[PDB]
Amino acid sequence: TXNDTXX
């Protein structure tokens, strides 16, 4: 759900 660890 963002940039840190994809998601």
Side-chain angles (χ1 to χ4, degrees):
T1 43
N3 293 295
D4 189 10
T5 309

